[PDB]
Amino acid sequence: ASAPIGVAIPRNNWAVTCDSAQSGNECNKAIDGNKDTFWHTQYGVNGDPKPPHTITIDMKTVQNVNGLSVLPRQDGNQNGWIGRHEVYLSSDGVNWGSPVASGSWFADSTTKYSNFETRPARYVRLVAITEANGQPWTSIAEINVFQASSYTAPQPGLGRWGPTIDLPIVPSAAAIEPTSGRVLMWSSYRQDAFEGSPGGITLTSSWDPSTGIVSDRTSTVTKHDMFCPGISMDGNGQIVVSGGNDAKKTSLYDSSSDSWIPGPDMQVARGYQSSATMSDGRVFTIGGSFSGGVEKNGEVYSPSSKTWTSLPNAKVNPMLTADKQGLYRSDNHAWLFGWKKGSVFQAGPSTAMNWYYTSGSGDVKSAGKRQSNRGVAPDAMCGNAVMYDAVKGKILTFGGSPDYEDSDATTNAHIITLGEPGTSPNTVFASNGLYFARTFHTSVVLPDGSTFITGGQQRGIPTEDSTPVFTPEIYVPEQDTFYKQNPNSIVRAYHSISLLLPDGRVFNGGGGLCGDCTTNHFDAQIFTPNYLYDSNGNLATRPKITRTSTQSVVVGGWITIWTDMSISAASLIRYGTATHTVNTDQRRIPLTLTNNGGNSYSFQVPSDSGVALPGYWMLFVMNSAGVPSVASTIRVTQ
């Protein structure tokens, strides 16, 4: 199931208007409180007018609207289920502006929802752009509109939430398709559940930021239910999705052909492991006792030989947390970062940090404990870790809880500074820690090197939406300060994701995936950071990268760019992938620019591919006002 975020508005005084209605299936049968009566657009002898079809509700007075729900016809007939759709709000009834929500609902008779940030309105319009199975009609048995207890304008300067993207699945795993800019998402063998999977199937969905279109398809070609996997973008530009519900399978997503290709089986069955791309483009993984059984030492994927090779001396024991549930949880979601000379740094969640090595049959060396002058940091299962300055080896870690479940989260946060593999990194506390203790939260590094932190809950109860944290935070390293941003209204805890979009906004979605529970979130929202807004709250003018000398570069190589205005800073941000709070693909390189004069600039990609990990990267430039360009895609090879 799912649920609205608000409380249903009384429909006594309501008036409705529809583009077309068949006798006996009048527009007002969608608001009569009877599940057995439905509005249905014109059909039969005199015509079957095709969508878009529209229903507009005049609520008579201004209400603090934060959602709507649609109950499909309940007579066992599929005709008229709404597929692609848009939701619009108005106070006058003539000017509708931009949709507050848009996307595509799954093709079945369950109640569908559009949940979105509170906005005062008297009129609510639902546009059914397509019927879920491509037929001409629209039908609705019951439509409801929901309200928040109050409305508060967003605070100036603290970013903005919206719109909502309605989806046909809960996006519990997601990646950016770097060659197209689309967001790729997947759930499990079904749209709302992973429990009782027979394996061999994953439902996926994609959203195109440039057009707003949502699609969906069924991945079976790789015979892999990809729920609870490792995810890494390898050096050949393919996303390696390892294990999960089909605990030994590997599937490869190719952005260029937008297709899934079978990969080699892993040597060890795993689920909830982290995997990390290495300096040579290979993928290292370790742990993962959610599925498959024993100690899960490391193994390495080679895209050139198409093999997984066991690294049994890359021992998982030093990175286990003290989870009260034991092995099932204690090797999960390692905070892995590819680093110099084939090494992988493990920053947590265990107190003990470790260096993993991939030469020979593998190795592990203690890197000391995550700690500060406030003490030794406790285990932080489902805390996050973000490499916001790869050149200086800077990792920000934050949140999480000592146990996977039934454990209080903390405000702990640290800055880890990596040097050479095998040396114990310096670790300090980050400012005074988070504003809000949270676990199951997600995070992304932004073009300006700040880290955006959102969602989670204060006490980890997977699939329950209790103690939610609605206020995101941004860490600004130059000030060693956290800043609360404007809050959202949708809980984003267990099974949620966040990704940085090429346009510099943040895509935050999912949560739930528990079948009959009411806590499934079939949606995502956009967060627009303050750096995209001017002083009056309007979208700022953005610098444009008018030309680049090349789109593919070897580490140590030079790139020259031309812009339409002078730029004060630039960064490269590696494209991200996300599930279960893990994103081992994103990282940021601040660029040292040579000013060529005439709004022409040059920079060198770092020569160490343990810093500039091979794969796809976003080039962002920022003007003097701090506004970033949209990203230019750069392929980095080694």
DSSP 424-459: PPEEEE-TT--SS--BS-EEEE-TTS-EEEE--BSB
Q: Residue 110 to residues 105, 115, 120, 302: CA-CA distances in angstroms?
A: 10, 16, 28, 44
CA 416 distance to own-chain centroid: 24
Asked if omega into 163 is within 30° of 0 (cis), the reply is: yes
Residue 330's H or E segment, with its range, is helix 327-330
Task: Pick the closer one to Ca ion by CB: 29 or 414.
Answer: 29
Site string for Ca ion, 87-126 (x = CB under 5 A): ----------------------------------------
Q: Which stretch binds Ca ion (CB under 5 A): 138-146, 253-261, 484-492, 591-599?
A: 138-146
Which C-beta is closer to Ca ion: that of 53 or that of 249? 53
| Contact status, residue 509 vs residue 497, Cβ threshold 8 Å | yes
Supply the minimum distance, in Å, between the C-beta of residue 121 and Ca ion.
Answer: 23
CB 431 within 8 A of CB 489: no
Would residue 494 show up in a list of annotated catalytic residues for this protein? Answer: yes
Output 142 or 523, the one with its CB closest to Ca ion.
142
Contacts of 442 (CB under 8 A, 6+ apart): 384, 453, 454, 455, 456, 492, 496, 497, 498, 508, 578, 581, 583
In the complex with Ca ion, the residue whose CB is nearer, 28 or 560, is: 28
Distance CA 176, CA 585 (A): 11
DSSP per residue, 282-310? -EEEE--BTS------EEEEETTTTEEEE
Q: Residues 29, 182, 492, 580: which binds Ca ion (CB under 5 A)? A: 29
- Of 26-34, 259-267, 382-390, 578-586, the window that binds Ca ion (rule: CB under 5 A) is 26-34
**What are the DSSP calls for 508-563, one per residue?**
EEE----TTSS----EEEEEE-GGGB-TTSSBPPPP-EEEES-SEEETT-EEEEEE
Assess 282 for contact with Ca ion (CB under 5 A): no
Query: Least distance to Ca ion from the beta carbon of 146, Å?
Result: 18
In the bound state with Ca ion, the residue whose beta carbon lies nearer, of 37 and 458, is 37
The minimum distance between CB 29 and Ca ion, in angstroms, equals 5
Residues 543-562 contacting Ca ion, CB under 5 A = none
Decide if residue 75 touches Ca ion (CB under 5 A): no
Q: Does residue 218 touch Ca ion according to CB under 5 A?
A: no
Catalytic residue, from 43, 189, 301, 494: name it. 494
Closest to Ca ion by CB, 75 vs 406, is 75
Please tell me whether residue 78 adopts helix, strand or coil conformation.
coil
Classify 391 as helix, strand or coil: helix
- Tokens of residue 614, six digits: 């091979």
Which range touches Ca ion (CB under 5 A), out of 137-145, 224-232, 405-413, 547-555?
A: 137-145
Helix (H, G, I), strand (E, B) or coil at 393: coil
Minimum distance between the CB of residue 137 and Ca ion, rounded to whole angstroms?
16
**End-to-end CA gap in the chain:** 47
Contact 263, 223 (CB under 8 A): no
Residue 69 binds Ca ion, judged by CB under 5 A: no
- 3-class DSSP assignment, residue 181: coil
CA torsion through residues 620, 432, 334, 314, sign: positive
The whole-angstrom separation of Cα 345 and Cα 388 is 15
Which residue in the shown chain puts its C-beta closest to Ca ion? 37
272 annotated as a binding-site residue: yes
Selection from 414, 549, 553, 530 nearest residue 480 by Cα? 414
Q: Provide, rounded to whole angstroms, the least separation between the CB of residue 136 and Ca ion.
A: 21
Smallest gap from residue 20 Cβ to Ca ion (A): 17
User: Which span sits near Ca ion by CB under 5 A: 28-36, 307-315, 357-365, 545-553?
Assistant: 28-36
Chain positions 478 to 537 lying near Ca ion, rule: CB under 5 A, are none
Minimum CB separation of residue 57 from Ca ion in Å reads: 14
Minimum CB distance to Ca ion, residue 70 (Å)? 11
- Which of the ranges 5-13, 21-29, 449-457, 503-511 carries the binding residues for Ca ion, by CB under 5 A? 21-29
With CB under 5 A as the contact rule, the residue among 4, 16, 25, 37 that binds Ca ion is: 37
Is 53 annotated as contributing to ligand binding? Answer: no
Kindly state the number of chain residues that form the binding site for Ca ion, as judged by CB under 5 A: 5
Closest approach of Ca ion to the CB of residue 67, in Å:
19
> 22 φ, ψ to 5°?
-90, 135
Q: Does 313 bind Ca ion (CB under 5 A)?
A: no
Of the pair 75, 408, the CB lying nearest Ca ion is at 75
Output the smallest distance, CB 110 to Ca ion, in A. Answer: 16
Instruction: CB nearer to Ca ion: give 34 or 551.
Output: 34
Instruction: Specify the residue, 34 or 259, whose C-beta has the smaller distance to Ca ion.
Output: 34
Tell me whether residue 139 or residue 629 sits nearer to Ca ion (CB atom).
139
Residue from 7, 8, 34, 359 that binds Ca ion (CB under 5 A)? Answer: 34
Find the helix or strand (DSSP H, E) in which 329 lies.
Answer: helix 327-330
CA distance 414 to 351: 12
Decide if residue 139 touches Ca ion (CB under 5 A): no
Identify which of 502, 499, 447 has the alpha carbon closest to the alpha carbon of residue 628. Answer: 447
Residue 512 neighbours by CB under 8 Å, 6+ apart? 2, 170, 172, 192, 463, 494, 495, 519, 520, 521
Stretch that binds Ca ion, among 23-31, 116-124, 239-247, 546-554 (CB under 5 A): 23-31
The values of phi and psi at residue 390, to 5°, are: -65, -30
**Interacting stretch for Ca ion, rule CB under 5 A, among 27-35, 96-104, 170-178, 319-327?**
27-35
Binding site, residues? 272, 494-495, 580
Binding site residues, Ca ion, CB under 5 A? 29, 32, 34, 37, 141
User: Looking at the annotation, which residues are catalytic?
Assistant: 494
Binding site for Cu cation, residues? 272, 494-495, 580
